[PDB]
Amino acid sequence: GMKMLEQLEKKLGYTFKDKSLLEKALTHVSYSKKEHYETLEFLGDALVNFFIVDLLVQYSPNKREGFLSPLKAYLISEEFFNLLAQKLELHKFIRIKRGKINETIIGDVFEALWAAVYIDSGRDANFTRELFYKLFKEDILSAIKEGRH
């Protein structure tokens, strides 16, 4: 009946001050050239990279870089990022032209989405960090015990 252009803030557990910041992260070039998520994703690349290795360092049974690197590569692959986005029904809110979206846009939007939240929050790394954990902390650890990649 309702919820089509949004409901994702209800998934995240975060309501944006600036809606066009959430929009932008969900907007691919083909749909909008003025403002799309390219610059947000670049930030979100490194922003999310820190959220994950900060967990890695803490919960991995090892500690040595040799056992952390192959595990790190996995937890920050588009593939895994998809499994994290699926929990967001991300594909649903992306604003993309034509019928070819793909798995590359997704994780990237997954990337631009946590950078938008970051920036929305007034550059609140901790909060945003914590918002990220409430959603996928569970899943990352799990992925840490089974040892994938």
Add this chain to the structure above:
Amino acid sequence: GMKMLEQLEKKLGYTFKDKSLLEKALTHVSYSKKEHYETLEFLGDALVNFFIVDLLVQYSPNKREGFLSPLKAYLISEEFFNLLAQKLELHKFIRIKRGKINETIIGDVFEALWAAVYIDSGRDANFTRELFYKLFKEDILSAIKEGR
């Protein structure tokens, strides 16, 4: 603390609650197989990459990723990390046995220092990022505008 640490802190502009936390970041495995900077370096790598890209995203006059990546590549270079490490004469505090300090090792310790700052502060990314800007934002800015 100790008869040395205390000065790394005044330069850094931050005093640790955990003294051995800062030491482990300065300690090469050659000096202590048990507690050495390797894991902190893991953290601080992602940590430092974050602070710097954040500044990049913010102050770059060109936003196109095709413009961003390059300067970034330098901003995380071990060359540039050494530029920043010089600001606290970090080689002076590094713990190492049989063998000499390098720029690489200095870059690895730079990373490890910031992860330890981050952890010792209560895993406070905001505070740590600001301490990082207080010290280095000015050099990163002059840098971004193709400052040799």
